[PDB]
Ligand SMILES: CC(=O)SCCNC(=O)CCNC(=O)[C@H](O)C(C)(C)COP(=O)(O)OP(=O)(O)OC[C@H]1O[C@@H](n2cnc3c(N)ncnc32)[C@H](O)[C@@H]1OP(=O)(O)O
Ligand SMILES: CC(=O)SCCNC(=O)CCNC(=O)[C@H](O)C(C)(C)COP(=O)(O)OP(=O)(O)OC[C@H]1O[C@@H](n2cnc3c(N)ncnc32)[C@H](O)[C@@H]1OP(=O)(O)O
């Protein structure tokens with residue numbers, strides 16, 4: 211059967227803005243929170259209005275007094291020398307570096323972020339940071355503050371939206387995804403020096419002109435995060451519940467980020 | 477297939493804005509022309525920049541002095557009574573009608589229009605017509621003239637963007653797609669007077685408020701569009717050429733609409 215037929219079959223009644231709003235409150239999402247969100251649309255079961263419903267639901271709970279952030283990574287703009295998903299012929303690499311269109315926050319699609327993110331990032335009043343590989347989008351009270359001045363180097367480091375979320379004592383919401391999607395733990399890797407440094411590259415508009423721009427980042431390794439997540443959960447203070455069929459987690463970003471930092475040093 | 481490794485192996489060298497631009501000019505696309513575009517991204521072969529490269533290429537060739545149109549249909553808003561892809565239990569139908577978010581031109585995503593349209597839809601200075609099921613988006617000189625005052629009933633009829641393209645002696649561009657994707661033939665169906673009406677439903681904003689609205693339209697049938705296409709290419713004028721691996725067709729909209737109108741009449 212098609213993906214969609216299975217999704218419908220595993221749903222007893224439709225998910226709606228209203229039932230999603232209800233499930234989010236039940237889990238503990240509150241007006242005025244700062245929350246970074248990671249999601250799988252399909253994991254919820256069938257939704258009337260798909261991604262738009264999920265976005266509107268989150269907004270209705272958090273409100274404009276709170277802030278929603280999602281990662282909007284665009285790794286298709288990276289140096290093809292290092293591509294594996296899929297690799298392309300070596301003879302294409304320079305053509306790509308010379309022709310791939312420059313990052314533009316209002317235009318460039320995301321890769322591997324999900325339909326909720328694609329909806330969110332083009333939604334009215336949502337704002338996006340200027341990083342060409344590792345940007346975030348945000349909506350609400352601290353949206354501009356969170357996304358402004360993202361350093362080109364160390365995209366998940368002390369000068370990124372993650373650090374701004376940390377200073378706001380924000381929350382992480384995982385909807386139907388595990389710890390390997392939990393971007394905030396990249397901040398633990400930065401602070402522990404857990405992973406090696408790499409020269410990266412991306413196309414940007416600089417002084418009006420298109421430049422292939424190089425910089426330093428960390429070779430972030432998500433495979434760790436599942437391990438870290440299981441140990442973090444034993445310590446307590448991860449709230450768990452369902453949004454439709456989606457296994458969801460809600461936690462404080464400071465808590466997991468501080469635990470992650472110790473996990474890598476010990 | 478649609479697997480990325482297969483799309484890379486289908487391609488000798490990458491497609492770029494520059495190569496796509498050149499292919500479009502070779503086919504007959506010109507500065508200042510009015511053109512409605514239908515596309516498959518995968519059909520072209522691997523593109524550096526994907527959908528962004530295709531939109532930039534089109535805009536480069538046509539320029540602000542021309543007009544680009546694309547269908548931005550949103551059939552996930554239709555009455556679930558008739559869904560087949562997939563169908564949903566009858567018990568969900570009234571809940572769907574009570575809960576599916578209303579059409580909002582800056583928010584409502586498209587369904588089955590393709591990645592090129594989803595990219596295009598969100599560009600700056602792109603304007604979208606007002607129809608919850610059969611909207612269009614446009615950019616350039618005639619973008620407002622074409623998209624304004626679309627009627628709710630007979631969505632592809634005499635008060636639709638299709639008739640405005642017809643009046644402007646515009647062109648239809650198919651990229652790696654067939655005549656079942658040729659929306660303009662709907663205007664033929666309306667005009668023939670030969671086809672049968674149906675009651676349809678969708679959620680709109682009326683009085684600044686969400687309502688499920690019912691209206692009349694044609695039971696547009698794209699299998700007759702395909703029959704019309706085969707005959708038209710035997711009889712009428714159509715330019716064929718390639719964009720990467722994509723077989724493409726460029727034709728005058730007035731020519732196929734007039735032919736189809738006769739075809740439906742017999
Ligand atoms: C550690 C790091 O920094 S990594 C970067 C962080 N990453 C993230 O935050 C991403 C988290 N999300 C994930 O990891 C997810 O597993 C994803 C997005 C990669 C894939 O999950 P999916 O549920 O398959 O995809 P997505 O969430 O885009 O939903 C699309 C699917 O929903 C389904 N769907 C479509 N409409 C509906 C609907 N109305 N209701 C329910 N499901 C629907 C379809 O099957 C669709 O699949 P298709 O695009 O193949 O047609
Ligand atoms: C009756 C009426 O009026 S119909 C309304 C009018 N309809 C239309 O205009 C629709 C016309 N288009 C079609 O019919 C097409 O056949 C479609 C859109 C239905 C499907 O075409 P596809 O090429 O499969 O999809 P689309 O154009 O969205 O491109 C996405 C695909 O491009 C491919 N792709 C992704 N990145 C790249 C890249 N850089 N380079 C090349 N291809 C890529 C992937 O295979 C992707 O598939 P996935 O999402 O399954 O991974």
Ligand SMILES: Nc1ccnc(=O)[nH]1
Nearest residue numbers: 285286293294295296
């Ligand atoms: N093709 C790819 C694009 C981006 N990253 C990869 O690993 N592969």
Ligand SMILES: Nc1ccnc(=O)[nH]1
Nearest residue numbers: 551552559560561562
């Ligand atoms: N789920 C569906 C949406 C729109 N049309 C269909 O046939 N099916």
Ligand SMILES: [Mg+2]
Nearest residue numbers: 314317532535
């Ligand atoms: Mg531009």
Ligand SMILES: [Mg+2]
Nearest residue numbers: 582597598599
């Ligand atoms: Mg817009």
